[PDB]
Amino acid sequence: IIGGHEVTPHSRPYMASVRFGGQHHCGGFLLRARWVVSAAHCFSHRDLRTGLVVLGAHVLSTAEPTQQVFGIDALTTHPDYHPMTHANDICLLRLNGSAVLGPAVGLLRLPGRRARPPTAGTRCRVAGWGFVSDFEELPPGLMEAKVRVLDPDVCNSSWKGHLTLTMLCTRSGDSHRRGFCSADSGGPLVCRNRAHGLVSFSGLWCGDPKTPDVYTQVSAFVAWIWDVVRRSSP
Numbered sequence: 232i233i234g235g236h237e238v239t240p241h242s243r244p245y246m247a248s249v250r251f252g253g254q255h256h257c258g259g260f261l262l263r264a265r266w267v268v269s270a271a272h273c274f275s276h277r278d279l280r281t282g283l284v285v286l287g288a289h290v291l292s293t294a295e296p297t298q299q300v301f302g303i304d305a306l307t308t309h310p311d312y313h314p315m316t317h318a319n320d321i322c323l324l325r326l327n328g329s330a331v332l333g334p335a336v337g338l339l340r341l342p343g344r345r346a347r348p349p350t351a352g353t354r355c356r357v358a359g360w361g362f363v364s365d366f367e368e369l370p371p372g373l374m375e376a377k378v379r380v381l382d383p384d385v386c387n388s389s390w391k392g393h394l395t396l397t398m399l400c401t402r403s404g405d406s407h408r409r410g411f412c413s414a415d416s417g418g419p420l421v422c423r424n425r426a427h428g429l430v431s432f433s434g435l436w437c438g439d440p441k442t443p444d445v446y447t448q449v450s451a452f453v454a455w456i457w458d459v460v461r462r463s464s465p
């Protein structure tokens with residue numbers, strides 16, 4: 232996260248860390264005790280057996296007593312996920328057990344089934360353990376930035392017409408670069424206490440307004456998300 236601040240330890244109990252080969256690789260959120268929502272691009276060319284989901288974390292390099300580590304029993308990539316364009320960049324993680332919900336491990340609500348995406352100017356927050364600068368500097372813990380939803384046409388223009396109808400954009404509230412960075416992928420964009428976005432892709436320079444922050448528009452996937460959950464439920 233660039234242009235953000237370190238959250239109070241465990242103040243966002245919904246945050247997940249997807250680890251590959253012991254290292255943090257992506258973010259995500261706890262939808263249900265055993266369900267994690269993330270970005271499909273995070274698992275592209277990766278052995279699911281080397282994957283771990285950590286919940287209840289603040290400092291990833293610390294074996295925190297609030298941390299709960301789970302394996303991935305199933306990965307469900309969106310059927311229409313196109314890696315080149317980043318279209319339908321969403322996936323669901325069914326863990327090899329259920330998280331014990333507490334003050335450090337919680338759930339995040341999806342937008343409604345009949346809910347529209349937020350309008351330009353809507354204040355949102357993005358969190359993660361991704362880089363804090365363009366010099367691959369690591370955060371002291373789970374960071375969070377204050378962003379504002381950016382007009383879809385202004386964004387699509389900046390992106391040379393490469394945005395899909397199911398993608399939203401953010402900008403900073405001021406003159407400082409604020410947004411996500413490498414390894415914040417999959418982690419949610421929280422608008423009005425709902426996961427409206429999902430970290431997808433940026434430019435070369437983290438938080439650069441010339442190459443705005445692209446998130447997966449979550450409201451479009453609410454129906455799919457519950458369909459996949461129900462399918463593997465008793």
Ligand SMILES: *[C@@H]1O[C@H](CO[C@@H]2O[C@@H](C)[C@@H](O)[C@@H](O)[C@@H]2O)[C@@H](O)[C@H](O)[C@H]1NC(C)=O
Nearest residue numbers: 383384387388390391392393394395396397
């Ligand atoms: C995004 O915009 C696309 C059109 O972009 C414009 O036209 C193309 C041919 C290029 O000249 C480009 O530089 C221009 O910005 C649309 O095809 C597409 O539907 C738009 N997507 C959304 C979500 O509105």
Ligand SMILES: *[C@@H]1O[C@H](CO)[C@@H](O)[C@H](O)[C@H]1NC(C)=O
Nearest residue numbers: 280282283301302303327328
């Ligand atoms: C869950 O998965 C992890 C990683 O594969 C493994 O270490 C752990 O033993 C598993 N737990 C159960 C109950 O299967």
Ligand SMILES: [Cl-]
Nearest residue numbers: 263264265266
């Ligand atoms: Cl569940």
